[PDB]
């Protein structure tokens with residue numbers, strides 16, 4: 257819901273909330289879905305470029321935010337990324353879009369736990 | 370003629386007429402066309418959705434009408450339905466349209482004169498396309514959702530879990546889709562029908578619960594059965610502590626004989642292919658078991674032929690070990706490869722080889738002079754039996770080739786020997802390897818499904834051996850699929866698909882986390 | 885053999901052939917080899933006091949050795965053994981040849997292809 261999410265951010269929604277729940281960090285690949293536990297990464301991993309652009313343009317968004325695993329936005333895309341037969345190369349395009357928006361090597365050189 | 374039929378209905382045409390003629394109910398598929406003998410089914414089976422919609426909207430139309438066979442509209446579509454290469458999936462679309470219009474489970478649960486539901490009829494007639502749709506059926510539109518067989522309880526992004534209805538697809542009922550699709554003998558697409566989402570997972574879930582342990586337990590009992598049988602036969606006289614092992618073989622042979630005696634009886638094998646594709650191991654196990662019983666019967670009498678039957682039990686008993694190769698994908702696919710190789714190539718090769726073996730055997734032995742009074746072993750091709758034995762050893766590369774036989778035409782005798790080598794060693798033996806490679810390529814792309822089909826037969830047999838109790842290894846319990854007191858036994862399957870990216874508004878539980 | 889493309893690709897071909905086909909072939913062959921070894925040695929009468937080498941299938945070890953040589957085409961096939969059922973003894977020998985020489989040995993070449 258891009259239109260609904262757009263007005264929530266203007267209303268004062270926390271764009272840096274971390275979903276540290278058990279479902280968002282599953283031990284396996286069947287009882288949960290890991291995406292980075294952040295709204296910026298959730299839109300990135302769900303093939304929602306419009307929300308990603310809106311979130312990145314926001315001044316309060318922390319692009320270099322680290323989750324419980326220590327993963328940044330780029331790390332979450334790598335884990336989420338799959339083969340071309342499964343994913344329509346949207347992660348690769350999303351990886352380029354987010355990296356260019358930051359325009360720095362800090363995000364690329366970040367190390368997780 | 371949709372326009373012509375439209376005014377006929379308004380004029381007072383009977384929309385429930387039954388065409389009970391011989392042509393509309395043919396005995397075969399060439400002298401008639403069966404469609405349900407009703408105008409509602411005729412338009413459905415002839416790909417005429419406009420007439421079907423007009424007929425269904427009519428107040429006098431009886432959707433749940435039954436023909437002489439007891440078939441309803443849904444049954445007629447199942448019989449009419451064919452493969453995708455023949456029919457443009459119009460039956461599947463027509464099946465959905467008619468079922469949604471009725472909006473009730475009465476039509477789906479109706480049984481014909483054979484006591485088969487439309488869901489069961491698809492498995493009985495091997496309609497994989499119809500069975501796939503019904504087993505995995507989701508109705509997105511509201512106001513009618515209990516008719517679905519597939520439900521997604523929760524979904525979060527690409528990860529979602531699906532629940533497949535198992536009220537009529539399980540071993541709990543007397544006759545179900547799973548039982549039919551495995552024990553069917555009138556269809557040749559069972560391995561394709563077992564690849565469906567609910568059927569494939571249901572077999573896998575029960576395989577790892579009880580079937581895996583019972584299969585290993587059966588192997589251990591049979592392995593010890595042959596080990597003990599081999600030792601007593603090999604170490605036979607030519608005591609008081611090892612007597613328990615000897616009684617085990619006799620008792621276990623009776624158990625196999627009784628179990629295989631009824632298993633073949635209830636299977637009702639009619640076609641030759643069914644023997645080699647569904648009951649080959651039901652006979653050789655029975656034959657091996659009765660040979661031990663026969664040997665014991667002859668042992669207590671004065672007949673010395675008990676040893677001959679005892680040896681046959683040993684050779685056949687160890688040969689029966691290849692049945693237990695299933696359960697393992699690598700060994701199971703290897704075993705099903707042997708069956709195709711034997712029937713397609715080995716049996717065909719042996720028939721021609723014997724003709725050449727026996728054909729040259731009489732010829733070579735014909736031009737053999739009688740041995741002199743001094744040397745009585747002048748020629749190794751003395752008789753027909755000797756000639757075949759020498760040629761048989763020649764084919765397998767054993768012994769020495771002595772062409773200095775007592776033949777009155779040594780050049781002619783050698784000419785036939787070289788011809789036999791070219792026909793057998795060069796032509797028949799070498800071509801068999803090439804021919805099997807063609808069959809290996811054709812089977813390797815489908816041998817995996819065949820092994821699962823053979824393995825699935827074992828799962829059902831083991832489950833039937835279970836008593837009335839101990840049946841606590843079923844699937845997930847009752848789930849509130851619909852708030853109107855609709856609880857169904859469902860199987861949970863989780864799938865991930867980064868393709869459509871839809872909005873989940875047709876779920877059962879808001880919370881995605883399992884609980 | 886690695887370092888050379890021709891020899892290196894040949895070596896990795898051996899590993900797949902051994903695991904996928906050779907090991908699978910040997911397991912079935914041993915069952916037939918040992919299964920017929922006990923059977924053939926079972927119907928062998930004791931040698932007379934005059935000739936102590938009446939039959940080459942004297943024991944289980946001898947029976948397997950003769951069948952092993954039969955599979956590889958070594959020695960001579962002497963069916964005039966001291967068997968109380970020569971027809972049955974020859975029946976198992978021919979069955980072993982069909983199962984091994986005709987079926988198992990030939991199918992291995994096709995499967996590896």
Ligand code: NA
Pocket residue numbers: 765766767768956957958959
């Ligand atoms: Na040789």
